[PDB]
Every structure is written in C-alpha cells, then in structure tokens.
C-alpha cells in the first residue's frame, strides 16, 4: 500500500507506538 511518512506515524501513534516511520514503501512503528 501507499505509504506516508506523516501519515504512518500518526497511525502508529494513535496504536500506541512512539514513532513510525515508512521503509521501502511500508509503514512499520516503533516503541
């Protein structure tokens, strides 16, 4: 899927994550 780096991290965040961040065209979150 599209991947927004604003938008990743948003998501990540609103799931309780700290950080998201878009890799090779993939949202992947951190904590």
Same mark, same amino acid.
């Given at each position: 899927?599209?991947?927004? $780096?604003?938008?990743?991290?948003? *998501?990540?965040?609103?799931?309780?994550? $700290?950080?998201? *961040?878009?890799?090779? $065209? *993939?949202?992947?979150?951190?904590?």
């Amino acid at each position: 899927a599209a991947c927004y $780096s604003s938008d990743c991290r948003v *998501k990540c965040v609103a799931m309780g994550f $700290s950080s998201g *961040k878009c890799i090779n $065209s *993939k949202c992947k979150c951190y904590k």
